[model samples]
Target: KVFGRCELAAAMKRHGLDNYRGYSLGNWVCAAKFESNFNTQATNRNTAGSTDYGILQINSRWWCNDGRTPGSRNLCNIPCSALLSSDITASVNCAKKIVSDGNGMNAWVAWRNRCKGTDVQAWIRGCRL
Candidate 1:
C-alpha cells in the first residue's frame, strides 16, 4: 500500500513477479509509478465509468468486476476491491495473467505512454532484488 519503491519490488519478487512473463522488474516498477504512484488503494474512474484498480490499475472492464459494470469478463476472478488492498498477491497474479496473454506490458496504457523505450533502471536504482 504505502510502501517504498524497493519494498514494492521486494513484494513483487516474493510473488514471483520479478521477471514473470518476460517482463523486467523495471517494467513493473515503471508502470506502477505512472499508474498509481505505488498506491495499492488507488482507484480511477474514467468518463465511461470504468475504473482502474490498485497499483497496476487493472481495468474493471476485462480483469475485475466493479459491480457497476456489466459484461465484465473478470479474467482475474477477483472483485475489483480485492486489488485495493495491502496484500498484492491477487493483484500481482492478475497482472501476470494479463501479461501471459501475449500483450506483455502493452496491456497497460501507462507503460506504453510513459515507460516504454526509456531508461528504466532508475525505477529500481536503489532497489535490491
Candidate 2:
C-alpha cells in the first residue's frame, strides 16, 4: 500500500522513529519519499548484486535473507519478502537495528543522497507529530 505523506509520518512516529538515532521523523519521511515513495512493495536491485526491499529499502546483502545475495548476513533474521508486506513491522524493526548498529540513516543511499544534510522538516510539516 502507498501512504500519504502525513500518514507515513505518523505511522513511523508511532514506531519510535520520531527521533531515533538523532534523526528526526522528518528525515525518515524524506528518506521514504525518495526511497520508495511510501510504497510498501517497492523494490530495487543494485549493481552490488544485492536487492533493496520495501519502503525503507532495506538491503538484502546484510539486513534480510533473500537466499540469492551471496554471503548475506541476514542480520535481521527475516525473509526479505517480509519487508514487502504492508504490515511494515519488519522493515521498521530492521531499520532500528541498523541505526542502533551506528549506521544511522546513511545506510540508505536515497537518504544520504537526498535527505542528508538538508532541511527535511518540510517533509513532515503539518503532520503535527
Candidate 3:
C-alpha cells in the first residue's frame, strides 16, 4: 500500500512516534519519505545478501528474519514480511525496537543522510494530529 506524505505522518504520530526516542515526527516523516516513499511493498536488496523490506525499509540483516539472511539477530522478533503492508503496525513496532538501540534513528542510513541535520519541519508541515 502507498500512503500520502502527511497521511503516513498521521499514522506514525498516532502510533506514538511523535518524539519517540528524541527524534521528532519530522525526522520520522522525512525518513519515511526518502526510505520508501511511504510504500508498504517496497524492498531493496543489500550487497550482503540481506534485504530491506517495507515502508521504513526494515532490514533482514538484523531487525527481521526473511528466512534468508544468515546469522540474522531478528531483534524485532518478527518476520520481515510483517513490515510489507498497509497496516504499518508491525512496521512501527519494529521501528520502536530499532530505535531502542544506541543507534537511535541512525540505524537507518536514509534517516542519517536525509532527515538528520536538515530542517525536517517541512516534511511534516500541516500534519496536525
Candidate 4:
C-alpha cells in the first residue's frame, strides 16, 4: 500500500486520471474507499460465482481472468492478480476502459450504492493535493 488519500490522488493524477470520462475525482477515490478500503489485495466472491478484484473491485465475470475459471470475457486480458498488485496502473487503465464501455462508474456496485450523490469532501479531506 498506499499511505492514504493524498498518495492515491497523486497516483491518479500522475496517471492522468484525475478526471476520467467526465467523472469526478472524488467519485473514483470514494469508490475505492468503499470498494476495497485502498487495499490492493482485496478480493470478494459474489453470490453469482463472480469475483471482485483489487481496490476498484473489477469483476472477473467481465473484466479480468480469475485463473481457475473459464469463459471470462477478460476484456482487460490480464490476470485478476494484476489488479491486486501495488502498482495500480493496470487496474486504473482497465477501469478507464470499463467506463469507456458505457457503464461509467455505474459498473461498480459500491460506487452506485455508496459514492453516488454522497458528500465526497471527506474522500479527499486530508493530505491536501
lDDT of 4 by residue, 14-126 (tens): 77677789886777788888899988888998745788989788988889988755567899988898898898899999999998997788888888998898986567666
Alpha-carbon runs more than 4 Å astray in model 4: none
Tens digits of per-residue lDDT for model 1 on 2-21?
77899988888888877787
- In the range 1-129, model 2's lDDT, one tens digit per residue, is 899999999899989898898988899999999999999999998756899999999999999999899888999999999999987789999999998887777788888998898999999888867
Alpha carbon deviation, residue 70, candidate 3 (Å): 1.4
Best by TM-score: 3
Better by lDDT, candidate 2 or 1: 2
The backbone clash count of each candidate, in order, is: 0, 0, 0, 0
The TM-score values for the models, in the order shown, are 0.94, 0.95, 0.96, 0.91
- The parts of candidate 2 lying over 4 Å away from their true place are none
Residue pairs in candidate 3 whose N, alpha carbon or C atoms collide under 3 angstroms: none
lDDT, candidate 4, at 14: 75
Listing every candidate in turn, what is its Cα RMSD in Å to the true structure after a full C-alpha superposition? 1.2, 1.1, 0.9, 1.5
Q: Provide the lDDT at 68 for model 3.
A: 91
Alpha-carbon lDDT of model 1 = 0.87
TM-score of 2: 0.95
Which 10 consecutive residues of model 2 have the lowest summed lDDT?
Answer: 99-108
Question: Candidate 1: where are CA atoms >4 Å away?
Answer: none
